Design a protein around this nucleic acid. Structure first.
Lengths: 103, 39, 201, 48, 117
RNA sequence: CCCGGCGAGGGGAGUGAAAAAGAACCUGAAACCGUGUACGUACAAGCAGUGGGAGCACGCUUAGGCGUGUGACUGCGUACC
């Protein structure tokens, strides 16, 4: 039993009880989210290949936490030209826990 | 009252001795053999 | 405007333009910084390349050897050499215009009045030159650090206050912009008030 | 009003140039003099 | 007003050497070499952040192509058939399905083959 | 007091708040040189890293796996002024 849905820019394959890290979403960290669009749900009789999405599939998940990723460093250099610079970066994310997959 | 005192003492004199040993006039170059790419 | 007394419950009238101005912080800042710079005493020196004890002989010849080129034992890049840009004694005092020096005083006095930090009485003295009497009198009015200004400098008062760290006395003529900001409370006799008012014009 | 509360008027104090200190400052390594030539020498220049 | 340069310079040097742990030989002991090594590593990391997105797509393509010919169809025809059937499945998802679920992949292949018709 | 050449240098005992303050005696960095533990290495070709990535060891943990160290194999890649 697993499903495929299209979150904020990418696609994920997930099952019940999993924890999935996504892009930032503007939702408080206590409540549920709905993913109306689904691409495929499969259990033994896996024939739910919805062409532009499926008909009745929805996914139930609730927001767990917000935070920033791990810092990376950007270095630009040009040999024997008297030029260099540096810059850091950290990325926002959002965790959800899947609670219900319904056909 | 000898050991450490004079033993370390000589290491001061060696510095000045090597310092003077560099008069450098005796450099004796002109690399007497013919010039590398002469006329 | 009307200036309330302290121990006589009367009123004093002074020039509005000398005690009721606004606060021009930029002018005051410039004046106080200039005053601070005038107290310096620039007495320092170093030795240039030409002023180091040594000789003008070349250390070694120009070419031939494997070392770098050198021409003086007192070069600034050698140990025990000279300082590249040595210092001479200087003079750091600045200039302040007469007119823009008085405006700062007027603004400061206006601010002191607005902040209730200025106290006006009519008479202030001690009978004998003893520090304990002055300390007792100051404790009566609940004052700890102040700047006493009097119309004429009494020698008894001046002697009694010399050993007190937080207390200083002055005259109408001898006031400065910094002393007005350093302390919390300022007390002036009425005659001193009139003298200051006519002096600032 | 207090000796550690006054501030200068805005825009009346500019920093000032410091040549030959690193790359980021934009003024290191020939400090704005260009490359070789008479005008890039200690004491170089021509009369009026 | 003389200023000494000991503490600041020592701290700045120690900052770099702590970034060169694990490098071979003098490239983790002396400042003049560790500095250049760290700069090179920065450049390489910046460049590789782009290439990482290409190698994985290459791998996904290869796995999908291998799994599709098990069911008697080429990669290009399979991908084209999916588009004529209006199927939007990411190549990462397709490779994952190919590895971990053969029956679903067979269903997808049969659908695409019918779509080509 | 003990080993030693009635040596040099040590290990105890004792003073002192402290002897890892013992006379080369405040503090005590870096290059440089060692002992011990964990992993890798004797069919393998190059600015020695970076992006992937098994296995092994240690710690936490309730599953589930995390954290630290090492790094087989593989794509790309000819220092600085």
């Amino acid at each position: 039993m697993y499903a495929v849905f299209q979150s904020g820019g990418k696609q994920h394959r997930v099952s019940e009880g999993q924890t999935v890290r996504l892009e930032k979403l503007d939702i408080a960290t206590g409540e549920t989210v709905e993913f109306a669009e689904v691409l495929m749900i499969a259990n033994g009789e896996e024939v739910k290949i919805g062409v532009p999405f499926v008909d009745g599939g929805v996914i139930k998940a609730e927001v767990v936490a917000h935070g920033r990723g791990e810092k990376v460093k950007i270095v630009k250099f040009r040999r024997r030209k008297h030029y260099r610079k540096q810059q850091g970066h950290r990325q926002w994310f959002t965790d959800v826990k899947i609670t219900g997959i319904s056909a | 009252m000898t050991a450490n005192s004079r033993s370390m003492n000589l290491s001061n004199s060696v510095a000045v001795t090597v310092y003077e040993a560099w008069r450098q006039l005796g450099y004796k170059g002109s690399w007497w053999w013919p010039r590398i790419r002469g006329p | 405007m009307e200036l309330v007394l302290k121990d006589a419950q009367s009123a004093l009238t002074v020039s509005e333009t000398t005690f009721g101005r606004d606060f021009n912080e930029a002018l005051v800042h410039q004046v106080v910084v200039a005053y601070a710079a005038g107290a310096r005493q620039g007495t320092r020196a170093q030795k240039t390349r030409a002023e180091v004890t040594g000789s003008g002989k070349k250390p070694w010849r120009q070419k031939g050897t494997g070392r770098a080129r050198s021409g003086s034992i007192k070069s600034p890049i050698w140990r025990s050499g000279g300082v590249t840009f040595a210092a001479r004694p200087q003079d750091h005092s600045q200039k302040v215009n007469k007119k823009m020096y008085r405006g700062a005083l007027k603004s400061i006095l206006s601010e002191l009045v607005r902040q209730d930090r200025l106290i006006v009485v009519e008479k202030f003295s001690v009978e004998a030159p003893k520090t304990k009497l002055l300390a007792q009198k100051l404790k009566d009015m609940a004052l700890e650090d102040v700047l006493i200004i009097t119309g004429e400098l009494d020698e008894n008062l001046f002697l009694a206050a010399r050993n007190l760290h937080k207390v200083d006395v002055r005259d109408a003529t001898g006031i400065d912009p910094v002393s007005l900001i350093a302390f919390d409370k300022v007390v002036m006799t009425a005659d001193a008030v009139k003298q200051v008012e006519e002096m600032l014009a | 009003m207090r000796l550690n509360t006054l501030s200068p008027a805005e825009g009346s104090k500019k920093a000032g140039k410091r040549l030959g200190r690193g790359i980021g400052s934009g003024l290191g390594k020939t400090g704005g003099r260009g490359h070789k030539g008479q005008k890039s020498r200690s004491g170089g220049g021509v009369r009026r | 007003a003389r200023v000494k340069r000991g503490v600041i310079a020592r701290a700045r040097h120690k900052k770099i050497l702590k970034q060169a742990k694990g490098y071979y030989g003098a490239r983790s002991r002396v400042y003049r070499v560790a500095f250049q090594a760290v700069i090179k590593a920065g450049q390489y990391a910046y460049r590789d952040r782009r290439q990482r997105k290409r190698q994985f797509r290459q791998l996904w393509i290869a796995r999908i192509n291998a799994a599709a010919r098990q069911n008697g169809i080429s990669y290009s025809k399979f991908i084209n058939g999916l588009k004529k059937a209006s199927v939007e499945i990411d190549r990462k998802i397709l490779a994952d399905i190919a590895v971990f679920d053969k029956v679903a992949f067979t269903a997808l292949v049969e659908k695409a083959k019918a779509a080509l018709a």
